Structure formats: structure tokens, C-alpha cells
């Protein structure tokens with residue numbers, strides 16, 4: 438149905454936007 442995060446538990450709809458969420462609120466290994 439939707440796409441979820443891989444760090445917390447916040448969803449958007451599809452990868453399309455979700456990608457951004459991650460980079461800024463989790464910032465891979467930065």
C-alpha cells in the first residue's frame with residue numbers, strides 16, 4: 438500500500454519523496 442522508513446516508522450506514499458526524509462533526519466552515516 439505505502440512505503441515506510443528504515444530507521445523510525447514514518448511513511449509517505451512511495452520512495453519518490455521518502456528518500457529525502459531519510460537523508461536529512463537519519464543521514465546514513467553522517
Ligand SMILES: [Zn+2]
Pocket residue numbers: 442443444445446447458459462463
Ligand atoms: Zn525515518
